[PDB]
From Swiss-Prot, chain A:
Protein name (Swiss-Prot/TrEMBL): Calmodulin-1
Gene3D superfamilies in the cross-refs: EF-hand
Cross-link named Glycyl lysine isopeptide (Lys-Gly) (interchain with G-Cter in ubiquitin), sites: K21
Modified residues (Phosphoserine): S81, S101
Molecular functions (GO terms): adenylate cyclase activator activity; calcium channel inhibitor activity; calcium channel regulator activity; calcium ion binding; calcium-dependent protein binding; protein kinase binding; protein phosphatase activator activity; protein serine/threonine kinase activator activity
CDD domains given in the database record: EFh
Annotated GO CC locations: calcium channel complex; calyx of Held; catalytic complex; centrosome; cytoplasm; cytosol; extracellular region; myelin sheath
Residues the record lists as binding Ca(2+) 4: D129, D131, D133, Q135, E140
Protein's organism: Homo sapiens (Human)
Record PTM N6,N6,N6-trimethyllysine, positions in chain: K115
Swiss-Prot record, chain B:
Result for mutant: R444E: Decreases channel opening, and thereby decreases channel activity
Record keywords: ANK repeat, Calcium, Calcium channel, Calcium transport, Calmodulin-binding, Cell membrane, Disease variant, Glycoprotein, Ion channel, Ion transport, Membrane, Metal-binding, Phosphoprotein, Repeat, Transmembrane, Transmembrane helix, Transport
Effect of I157T: In HRPTTN; decreased localization at the plasma membrane; no change in calcium ion import across plasma membrane
UniProt name for this protein: Transient receptor potential cation channel subfamily V member 6
PANTHER family: TRANSIENT RECEPTOR POTENTIAL CATION CHANNEL SUBFAMILY V MEMBER 6, TRANSIENT RECEPTOR POTENTIAL ION CHANNEL PROTEIN
PTM characteristics: Glycosylated. Phosphorylation at Tyr-135 by SRC leads to an increased calcium influx through the channel. Probably dephosphorylated at this site by PTPN1. Phosphorylation by PRKCA at the calmodulin binding site delays channel inactivation.
Residue window of motif Selectivity filter: 515-519
Tissue and organ expression note: Expressed at high levels in the gastrointestinal tract, including esophagus, stomach, duodenum, jejunum, ileum and colon, and in pancreas, placenta, prostate and salivary gland. Expressed at moderate levels in liver, kidney and testis. Expressed in trophoblasts of placenta villus trees (at protein level). Expressed in locally advanced prostate cancer, metastatic and androgen-insensitive prostatic lesions but not detected in healthy prostate tissue and benign prostatic hyperplasia.
Membrane side Extracellular: residue ranges: 323-359, 418-423, 487-499, 520-530
Species of the source: Homo sapiens
Annotated GO CC locations: calcium channel complex; plasma membrane
Gene Ontology MF terms in the entry: calcium channel activity; calmodulin binding; identical protein binding; metal ion binding
Membrane topology of the entry: Multi-pass membrane protein
Signal peptide: none
Length: 148, 644, 619
């Protein structure tokens, strides 16, 4: 939705992915039904019908990725980050997946001395790991800068 | 080197021709008042050129002047055509410049003037080279897809672009999106460009046509190391069979990954390319499970049978060198009687006893083994290459050379035995240290010995080679210094330095501290000697041999996750080699076939896994729909200080 | 050292004179009631002094008393003038103190009283020294520009300041802004001070006039290592030619950077200064591309031709030392017949065979090569310096000394050959280990060998020198201990310790474990020996030689990004040296000239780059 940077699309792409558990680009009422039951909720069949039909511009009946990207730019929370942090993250992230890893904080720390054990690398991860996948986001990376 | 000198002279000359022309300078800034005064004249040179062979419309499009460019199109509509005629920017039209500058009004104005959407920017400044900072393509659709403008791509298709535009490299539009430095936004365009295909029957859909190297867009992401594009192209090639709670069972398609491959398949492309970013595709979702099922099942047992045949081969060669024929010395000791100790020599008619008939069997095992090496290795060197890319396959490297040099030195010994030449000690004593140190090849199939044999190689071509240039500086200076000190004295009470070849071999050993050091304690040594040897032992033993341990110790923890990535790529290179050379009676093809399961003729590999259940993530995106610690936090401040 | 003792006695004496004066104490706190009682008297001492030679108005301005200071100006307007007359704060007026305290009302009150805006605070407490904590300048405009008060700078210009005020160092206002510790706010003032120039024709604009060292404000940022001020001054010296999507082509001006430089140019200022913060300007935007275009094109081939001429020179010298003349021993062995082994000696009339006529050619190659060294290196030592700053050029350092000592020892051997002196082994055996170890100079032009030769130098003047003080302590204690043990015994069954010069040379080798160790196993050694050698081998071999490896290993990862910055500065020092000494027929001048392109007579270097995309949708 052409206001979104490189790291947000990479966050929203896998965010689209764990909804879509059949390996395509279509959110039917089924897959959003499988999510909302796993949240412990009882999904109303009208509620499942409304939430798909509310954001579906093409009218096919399945939410694809550009419509999930359009919806998420509406319901974006906010971010007001810095130039120095964003340029730091794009150099730190090497393959460009939008994520710094445990394999990619070893490279940054070896770049400035700083002998870490592989345990202490993962001990750095879990402090910045707000949600949890064993990876630090861009939103979590900003959080570990402007804390002071 | 002189081309960049010539290219800089072109850009300064272009700025000269603009200032020395009243049309081009007025089209440069904006000067909409000045164009109406010039273009109303009779001969106002509308087809004027420059250093890049550009017109006034190329200038107005390059410096982003919408107002001046429309005046040029009104007074002369022929300038929408007629691209640049220089060698550098050959073929680049004015539509190309408006697209790269990502202008929306100037592109739509040019398309109303019947611009060519199928022109080719086939200059030397658009080709894929390390000299150029960009590789955008040749066509306007290729330019709009790489600067990430979805408005102009949709605009160019509606005015009749070609979705299958191929370059001089043969690359389509989808190949160029992979070669771009912004991986995430290339994925967004890749879905868009396939969406407008949708009628590409052609007996070739869209993303299956290769370039002039035979690479599809799927395999080009494999070679160039686009980890982001590789995971995006996996969405088409998997099928979720069933989801049983926190347990899914996907079904990957091994039709472009598995090296059954009469064509060139993806495991050969990754393992032979020189990039260090392509070896990260060996950890992805179908490829990591494919290699392990080849290596555990059929890769490791066949590699440990070749490790045991070769080990019994190099024992059979060793006992032919121990029991080799010798006779006592024939004529005399009379070579000058103070420096000769050899007392046996080589025999001519060796095979005349029953104990040598056993050895003749053992030598024919060796020589036949030396021919078989030169028939399975040399017809890959002279055939697949003219030795241009044989050196570093992955980093595996020397074991091609050590097995050729072994098979050469056995056959030199065959020649010297048949013609009964004198010195067979020289071709043998190479052939043993080349022979047994090639057993280190078979230490890549064991995790204990695997990553250690890589660190031996990364020191010899590195932290040991740069030490042996500054060792040969030192032991040429001191060995020529110690030689002239003991040159004027007695060479039997201390004879470490009597010849200059011997003085080089003493000081090589005194640098290594493997022999003791010249001391007699009965006769007065030269007074200059004790000064120049105490100078020597400080910068040999106290300084420079304690600076290898400080340098190899510094390197060993820096490349300590690279050598683990190098070992997992040595298994893939071994597995593909064992799969290719062995027959099809052994080594069954990987994955389950699909003939008797209603899936076609291709080959599948299913992987099931337990993923998670992460509540805090899934609850945050769900509402959006609606109608040990102490020294870790010390490390982040160390990163905040480094970032600042 | 005693000056700081004397300066502390001045400050305590100033507080004494204030308390011992009813005017100065009342002006100190505020006491506006007490001033009216004193100043209405007849002889109330308005020109009273102190320890710093200050008046009552200097006190009221120093302790920031606006109310008391106006009372002093009303009762005595002469105190706005008359600066401090001490040696320490010489010349400092009351306007200076109100500006540094950044008072706005007291400055405007002094300017109404016709204060001097062109006074000079030329004391010893304002000069640029390591003793002083500040260097603000001499003029009130220099004081207001360094405490970052844009209100007072605008106020001082309107009352007739001088924008070209120069110190006793020659520094203008713009030079002083570079020497300040706050880099970012110095950039903000630098734009302000040039903005009020705008009529500085003068045949010198404003930021081109140098100080008394010949340095402009651009080159003074280069010497002092202001990376922030250096990038701010690059805005004036570039020109963006064209912007083609994510691709710009700038055009830098090499008129004060490139070392064509009949004047002293910026690559010589950075590479000879002693600061370790100036070597970070070798990574900036015009300088990093300038050095690489000199080194790849003309720097590396000319450095590898001098590496091959010198290598064939030191082979020609080596074979003159191998084939040097010797004759057999003349008289007798009769020197005392148990400790003499020499059996050849040096010849006098050596050149009488055809095999020595080849060597005479080889020796004249050597001696001519030894003169040429002393003609290209010694007239830079006695001319550009009296050996005050020759030692550490960058850190490059010893190779000046090793090539002089080589050319000296060849010429000593020339003297001993002509007068037919006895011992030529001593001047040769220096000249070879000095000669071949100088080939390590030519390992700075190869990235494989470059950063390793720096770590050899940073151990010899460091972690090996501090070990050889605590090695000579040990092998004086044990070698004098082992000597007296075997002093009373037989010096042929175990003769490692028979002389005291030999006992020092055994224990030096037993510390290094290069010779084995005294053991005979046929005769009973002293009982004290096995105790004192087991004590020795623990603190030589088990403790202290395993503590070099723990210390050199600890250092090697700490200075592991400094030695990479030292290597990129050894290339710049080599490139500038090769550019200076070679003629102009070789080594074309860097960059494109501007005569036939309509840009003047200066020399330009264009650099194009692709910047970003992620910061292009949003920028
Ligand atoms: C001599 C002639 C007879 C010798 C062997 C008979 C045939 C051996 C091969 C048979 C295939 C079966 C096999 O799999 O056998 C290879 C084993 C594998 O090792 P593993 O049990 O630890 O695998 C488990 C590793 N886990 C536990 C970490 C997961 O290894 C072995 O027996 C080693 C077999 C010999 C390999 C020597 C090759 C030369 C190596 C030089 C190194 C320098
Ligand atoms: C597929 C590739 C392999 C093909 C088959 C292998 C080779 C067999 C075929 C032909 C034999 C030729 C090889 C030997 C060549 C010279 C033969 C020879 O000259 O005689 C062999 C000797 C017998 O001695 P002798 O005849 O000289 O008389 C006694 C001498 N006197 C009196 C001093 C004691 O045999 C000895 O010595 C044996 C002692 C050596 C020690 C053990 C050998 C192997 C060691 C370990 C094997 C397993 C380890 C893990 C793998
Ligand atoms: C992987 C990284 C390391 C690889 C690089 C290492 C390079 C260095 C390795 C080897 C250098 C080759 C030296 C060979 C010299 C032996 C020449 C020979 O066979 O004859 C020896 C002769 C005299 O010996 P004599 O006792 O028979 O006569 C006694 C004199 N009378 C007759 C009056 C009694 O002495 C002579 O020729 C002296 C000739 C002096 C020249 C030595 C330097 C040559 C090489 C320089 C390159 C190194 C640059 C980088 C370090
Ligand atoms: C007459 C002599 C040449 C005259 C003019 C040269 C014109 C062109 C200069 C361009 C510089 C070369 C370059 O730009 O590349 C330098 C090195 C490549 O090393 P190489 O192939 O020459 O060494 C193996 C070759 N070998 C054993 C024969 C020395 O690149 C590296 O950084 C690797 C560091 C190599 C370490 C040793 C440096 C050279 C030693 C020479 C001693 C003889
Ligand atoms: C810029 C200018 C540089 C200096 C120019 C050098 C040449 C100067 C001209 C003459 C002086 C030659 C050397 C001075 C000492 C004399 C040595 C000597 O006396 O003759 C050399 C010996 C033969 O000895 P001879 O004269 O007694 O018998 C022969 C009797 N007659 C001559 C009648 C046949 O020949 C041998 O041993 C040769 C030993 C082989 C080892 C050489 C090391 C390899 C060379 C270069 C490596 C560098 C790599 C490049 C990077
Ligand atoms: C980084 C390097 C550190 C710098 C210090 C290096 C230390 C070594 C430097 C120079 C050597 C010192 C003197 C050696 C020459 C002595 C020759 C001599 O003959 O002298 C007389 C005596 C022994 O006479 P003898 O056995 O030959 O005759 C036979 C005696 N009969 C008849 C009794 C059997 O020798 C003596 O007493 C010599 C006096 C004993 C004390 C000398 C210590 C040197 C002074 C300060 C060192 C500071 C190091 C700590 C920091
Ligand atoms: C006569 C009788 C005893 C049979 C003896 C046969 C084996 C002892 C030889 C014959 C051919 C040899 C093979 C020839 C070619 C290769 C490939 C070669 O590949 C590499 O060197 C890859 C690593 C690199 O890139 O350097 C490793 C050894 C190997 C498997 C050799 C292993 C030992 C073999 C099986
Ligand atoms: C940086 C160095 C100085 C480390 C400190 C160790 C010293 C205690 C060593 C190093 C050099 C040594 C000297 C090198 C040369 C000589 C000359 C040597 O010659 C003689 O006087 C006897 C003749 C002979 O030995 O042939 C005797 C030992 C001595 C003084 C050595 C004594 C012990 C010294 C001073
Ligand atoms: C008769 C013929 C064979 C004459 C041959 C002479 C050359 C072998 C000599 C003469 C002048 C020498 C040069 C004179 C000056 C220098 C600069 C000198 O610079 C330093 O020492 C810088 C290091 C530091 O900062 O300490 C290094 C050696 C070098 C290149 C010398 C290299 C060897 C040269 C070319
Ligand atoms: C860290 C240490 C305490 C543990 C290991 C050290 C021991 C193995 C060393 C330390 C002291 C040594 C002893 C010191 C003195 C002597 C006397 C020595 O006698 C001689 O000098 C032989 C001729 C004679 O005088 O009779 C024989 C060895 C012996 C017992 C040594 C044997 C080896 C000992 C016990
Ligand atoms: C000169 C003759 C007598 C013997 C010379 C031995 C040399 C040429 C041989 C013997 C030992 C060999 C090395 C042994 C181990 C390794 C590590 C391996 O990962 C790559 C090959 C490599 C780096 C070999 C390179 C070649 C080598 C150095
Ligand atoms: C006593 C006589 C016989 C021998 C004396 C040799 C001494 C003076 C020489 C030989 C080896 C030389 C060293 C070799 C290597 C380096 C590292 C380099 O980066 C700077 C010079 C430096 C530090 C040299 C200094 C001088 C040196 C120590
Ligand atoms: Ca779905
Ligand atoms: Ca949809
Ligand atoms: Ca990553
Ligand atoms: Ca996360
Ligand atoms: Ca040792």
């Amino acid at each position: 939705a052409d206001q979104l940077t490189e790291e947000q699309i990479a966050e929203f792409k896998e965010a689209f992915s764990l909804f879509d558990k059949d390996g395509d680009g279509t959110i039917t009422t089924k897959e959003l039904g499988t999510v909302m039951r796993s949240l412990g909720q009882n999904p109303t069949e009208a509620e499942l019908q409304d939430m798909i039909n509310e954001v579906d511009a093409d009218g096919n009946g399945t939410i694809d990725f550009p419509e999930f990207l359009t919806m998420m730019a509406r319901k974006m929370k906010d971010t007001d980050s810095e130039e120095e942090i964003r340029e730091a993250f794009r150099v730190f992230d090497k393959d460009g997946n939008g994520y710094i890893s445990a394999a990619e904080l070893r490279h940054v720390m070896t770049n400035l001395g700083e002998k870490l054990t592989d345990e202490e690398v993962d001990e750095m991860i879990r402090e910045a790991d707000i949600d949890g996948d064993g990876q630090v986001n861009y939103e979590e990376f900003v959080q570990m800068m402007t804390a002071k | 080197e002189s081309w960049a000198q010539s290219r800089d002279e072109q850009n300064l000359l272009q700025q000269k021709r603009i200032w020395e022309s009243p049309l081009l300078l007025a089209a440069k800034d904006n000067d909409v008042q000045a164009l109406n005064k010039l273009l109303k004249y009779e001969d106002c040179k509308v087809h004027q050129r420059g250093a890049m062979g550009e017109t006034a419309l190329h200038i107005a499009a390059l410096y982003d002047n919408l107002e001046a460019a429309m005046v040029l199109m009104e007074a002369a509509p022929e300038l929408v055509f007629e691209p640049m005629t220089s060698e550098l920017y050959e073929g680049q039209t004015a539509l190309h410049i408006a697209v790269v500058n990502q202008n929306m009004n100037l592109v739509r104005a040019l398309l109303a003037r019947r611009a060519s959407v199928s022109a080719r920017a086939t200059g030397t400044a658009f080709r894929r080279s390390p000299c150029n900072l960009i590789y955008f393509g040749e066509h306007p659709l290729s330019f709009a897809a790489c600067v990430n403008s979805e408005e102009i791509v949709r605009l160019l298709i509606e005015h009749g672009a070609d979705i299958r535009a191929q370059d001089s490299l043969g690359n389509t539009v989808l190949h160029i999106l992979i070669l771009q430095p912004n991986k995430t936004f290339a994925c967004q365009m890749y879905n868009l460009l396939l969406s407008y295909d949708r009628h590409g029957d052609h007996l070739q859909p869209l993303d299956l046509v290769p370039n002039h190297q035979g690479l599809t867009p799927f395999k080009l992401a494999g070679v160039e190391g686009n980890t982001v594009m590789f995971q995006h192209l996996m969405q088409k090639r998997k099928h979720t069979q069933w989801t049983y709670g926190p347990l899914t069972s996907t079904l990957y398609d091994l039709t472009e990954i598995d090296s059954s491959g009469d064509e060139q398949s993806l495991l050969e492309l990754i393992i032979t390319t020189k990039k260090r970013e392509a070896r990260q595709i060996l950890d992805q979702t179908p490829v990591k499970e494919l290699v392990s099922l080849k290596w555990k099942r059929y890769g490791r047992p066949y590699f440990c049978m070749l490790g045991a045949i070769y080990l019994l081969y190099i024992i059979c060669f060793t006992m032919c060198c121990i029991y080799r024929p010798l006779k006592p010395r024939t004529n005399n000791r009379t070579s000058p009687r103070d420096n000769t100790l050899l007392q046996q020599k080589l025999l001519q008619e060796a095979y005349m006893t029953p104990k040598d008939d056993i050895r003749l069997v053992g030598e024919l095992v060796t020589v036949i083994g030396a021919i078989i090496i030169l028939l399975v290795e040399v017809p890959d060197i002279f055939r697949m290459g003219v030795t241009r890319f044989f050196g570093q396959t992955i980093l595996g490297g020397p074991f091609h050379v050590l097995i050729i040099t072994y098979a050469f030195m056995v056959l030199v010994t065959m020649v010297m035995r048949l013609i009964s030449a004198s010195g067979e000690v020289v071709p043998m004593s190479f052939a043993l240290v080349l022979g047994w140190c090639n057993v280190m090849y078979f230490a890549r199939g064991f995790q204990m010995l695997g990553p250690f044999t890589i660190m031996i190689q990364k020191m010899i071509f590195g932290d040991l080679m740069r030490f042996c240039w500054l060792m040969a500086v030192v032991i040429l200076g001191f060995a020529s210094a110690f030689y002239i000190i003991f040159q004027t004295e007695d060479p039997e009470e201390l004879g470490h330095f009597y010849d200059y070849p011997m003085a080089l071999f003493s000081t090589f050993e005194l640098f290594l501290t493997i022999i003791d050091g010249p001391a007699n304690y009965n006769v007065d040594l030269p007074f200059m000697y004790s000064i120049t040897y105490a100078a020597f032992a400080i910068i040999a033993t106290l300084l420079m041999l304690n600076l290898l341990i400080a340098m190899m110790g510094d390197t060993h923890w820096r490349v300590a996750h690279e050598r683990d990535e190098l070992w997992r790529a040595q298994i893939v290179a071994t597995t593909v080699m064992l799969e290719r050379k062995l027959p099809r009676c052994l080594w069954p093809r990987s994955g389950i076939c699909g003939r008797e399961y209603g899936l076609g003729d291709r080959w599948f590999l299913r992987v099931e896994d337990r993923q998670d259940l992460n509540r805090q993530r899934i609850q945050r995106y769900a509402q959006a729909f609606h109608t040990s610690t102490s020294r870790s936090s010390a490390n982040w401040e160390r990163l905040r200080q480094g970032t600042l």
